[PDB]
Amino acid sequence: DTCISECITPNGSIPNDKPFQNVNKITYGACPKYVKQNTLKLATGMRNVPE
Amino acid sequence: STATLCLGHHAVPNGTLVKTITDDQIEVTNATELVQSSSTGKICNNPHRILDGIDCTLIDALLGDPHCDVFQNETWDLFVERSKAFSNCYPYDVPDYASLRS
Amino acid sequence: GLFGAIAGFIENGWEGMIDGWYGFRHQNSEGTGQAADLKSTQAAIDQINGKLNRVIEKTNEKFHQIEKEFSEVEGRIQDLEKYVEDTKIDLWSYNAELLVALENQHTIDLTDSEMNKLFEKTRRQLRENAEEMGNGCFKIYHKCDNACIESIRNGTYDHDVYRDEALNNRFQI
Amino acid sequence: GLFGAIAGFIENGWEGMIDGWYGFRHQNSEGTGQAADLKSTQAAIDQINGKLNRVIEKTNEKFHQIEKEFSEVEGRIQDLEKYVEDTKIDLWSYNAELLVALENQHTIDLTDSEMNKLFEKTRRQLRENAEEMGNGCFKIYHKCDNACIESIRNGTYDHDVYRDEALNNRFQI
Amino acid sequence: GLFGAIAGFIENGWEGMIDGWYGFRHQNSEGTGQAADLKSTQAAIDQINGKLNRVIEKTNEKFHQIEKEFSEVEGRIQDLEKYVEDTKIDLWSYNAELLVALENQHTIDLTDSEMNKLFEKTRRQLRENAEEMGNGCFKIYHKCDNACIESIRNGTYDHDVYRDEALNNRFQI
Numbered sequence A: 001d002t003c004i005s006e007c008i009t010p011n012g013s014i015p016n017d018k019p020f021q022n023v024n025k026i027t028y029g030a031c032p033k034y035v036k037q038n039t040l041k042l043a044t045g046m047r048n049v050p051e
Numbered sequence B: 001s002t003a004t005l006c007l008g009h010h011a012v013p014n015g016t017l018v019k020t021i022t023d024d025q026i027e028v029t030n031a032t033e034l035v036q037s038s039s040t041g042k043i044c045n046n047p048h049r050i051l052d053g054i055d056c057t058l059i060d061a062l063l064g065d066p067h068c069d070v071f072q073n074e075t076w077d078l079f080v081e082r083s084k085a086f087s088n089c090y091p092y093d094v095p096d097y098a099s100l101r102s
Numbered sequence C, D, E: 001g002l003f004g005a006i007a008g009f010i011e012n013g014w015e016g017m018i019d020g021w022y023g024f025r026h027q028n029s030e031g032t033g034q035a036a037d038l039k040s041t042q043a044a045i046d047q048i049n050g051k052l053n054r055v056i057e058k059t060n061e062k063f064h065q066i067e068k069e070f071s072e073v074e075g076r077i078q079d080l081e082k083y084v085e086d087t088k089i090d091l092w093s094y095n096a097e098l099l100v101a102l103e104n105q106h107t108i109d110l111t112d113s114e115m116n117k118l119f120e121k122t123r124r125q126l127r128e129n130a131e132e133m134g135n136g137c138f139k140i141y142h143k144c145d146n147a148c149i150e151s152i153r154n155g156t157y158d159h160d161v162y163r164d165e166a167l168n169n170r171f172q173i
């Protein structure tokens, strides 16, 4: 398709905003390292102790 | 006579479980996803020069199989070979096809 | 976390404080109010955004590499090619896991630390004019209207100006 | 560690306390006794068992791989095969080393932290009725029999109930 | 860092203290003076030199390996050979980066911790004979000549010996 992306994989392009990816270990371009995890949430807040 | 002053911090109704060194799941007020897990399915023609191989592998476009002559003198950043690309010329074989192709 | 303030000596958080991360709640003669502390709130934020940048920094960027999917069985070289990628993915999958667990632990302790620092500082301002109720609240032993609270909140409260009044009420009236 | 309680302001530990990790020792009119604090003791334990699980989690699980021992000399491919394994073992040997050094440091600080939290909490209960002797012991300035100690230990001690008595003895009798 | 003393409640450091890392500055009747605390200064040093040794420890030591520079183009094996080295350098370049960022954060907190421990200890010595001015300085409410300061500094100050004098000046003279 006529779009913009610097990271290409057999599955299509994926945005490289994150540092890791779990789409394909085959990539070309500026791409997120591939890992086996489908998710890894980095805490960007303090602990939540609701009322 | 007296006054009360209480120090404190915020909280949100619904938080996000995260993992730490000592806890499997611990609720925090916010989190960001570090793993990109989806694609659109499409490959983008920018900023990398993508050459769609159509029905041709790189080799048949290299040698000159009639139906690949449309690729004469082409250049690419990334050549995209299709699973169903086929040869329609004199039967050949390449000893060390992998390295020639690479 | 390491400190004891958050999910510690401060029973719980304020779902209502939507203007800052850390804050104050008072109750004097004039009534009750609430106010976020922009200073400690920004220290936590700055630090968190600081690790965020380090983490989601600049991408791999690889071009021609080696094949990772194979249609025919070949043995020896293909074996080694796959092992190379496999052991790689495994090492990067560990790194990602650990990195995220360390950061998360630190983000918690750090934010627990900024709470506990707001407390000690505010505690050091009140001098002998107050006592800690043990729940993150200080009992101020003197008349403290709103402009008095504001000075504590904005760091200009002079303790001498209320010391004797304070001391009196504190020590057996 | 980072806190100062363990191997810090608390001279040493109690070889005799075999019922908990953290505890209390008092000396009042009725005599002397000892009791483990099950609450802080379980916080340290939970956290430690929590990292223990993360660490000794689920195994590699590899099947057909590549050869690592060779009987004949072959050059090029064999060179690369060995280097691949060697650089792998080296990277996993670093990870293991570092992981164990980080965890160990944290386990110490964390357990030093739970000691220091027991102290501040107990300190915040006593209000003006006590003073810290600087060795982890609080001098309680009022008559405190066993049921009085028990209430401190179980978190129900009311300081007002002994304040004036306390204040009196404290401030020049 | 996590504590609040350094670049925290202690406004700034002393460019002049060249005999220790942590220290004291007093102002009594006899005048003003300064002295480094060799004990806390050596705790920070020991710990820092301790990580320094761990880090710059014992070298790789590799002999015959694989080729990393190529004059002719060959494909498949050469592709894999380069990828093997490349992914290796990349993994070691991450390790080095992270290791240095973790250590640095810890060295700061740790040295912030030894400052804050000097404070609490000195604070626990003064008992009721002093108040904290909130800037790392204690206001001693009793006559304290040089030999008096020295005893605080060397850990032998007895608070009873000045308590009543202290208490008197403290509580409304």
Ligand SMILES: *[C@@H]1O[C@H](CO)[C@@H](O)[C@H](O)[C@H]1NC(C)=O
Binding pocket: A010, A011, A022, A023, A024, B037, B038, B039
């Ligand atoms: C990407 O492709 C492979 C097959 O090409 C598939 O196994 C994998 O699950 C796909 N990932 C996504 C997000 O579609």
Ligand SMILES: *[C@@H]1O[C@H](CO)[C@@H](O)[C@H](O)[C@H]1NC(C)=O
Binding pocket: A044, B030, B031, B032, C052
């Ligand atoms: C959660 O944190 C992320 C990263 O800083 C940010 O995108 C978002 O604003 C935060 N969520 C909320 C509700 O503020």
Ligand SMILES: *[C@@H]1O[C@H](CO)[C@@H](O)[C@H](O)[C@H]1NC(C)=O
Binding pocket: C146, C147, C148, C150, C151, C152, C154, C155, C156
């Ligand atoms: C602190 O509080 C008093 C009372 O409202 C005010 O006069 C003073 O200027 C305040 N300072 C700041 C920095 O807001």
Ligand SMILES: *[C@@H]1O[C@H](CO)[C@@H](O)[C@H](O)[C@H]1NC(C)=O
Binding pocket: D146, D147, D148, D150, D151, D152, D154, D155, D156
């Ligand atoms: C605390 O101590 C007193 C004295 O023995 C007792 O009456 C009280 O119920 C105790 N509380 C708990 C939870 O054990």
Ligand SMILES: *[C@@H]1O[C@H](CO)[C@@H](O)[C@H](O)[C@H]1NC(C)=O
Binding pocket: E146, E147, E148, E150, E151, E152, E154, E155, E156
């Ligand atoms: C502490 O100070 C006093 C006063 O100078 C002195 O007699 C005492 O022996 C000192 N102790 C040490 C260990 O220097």
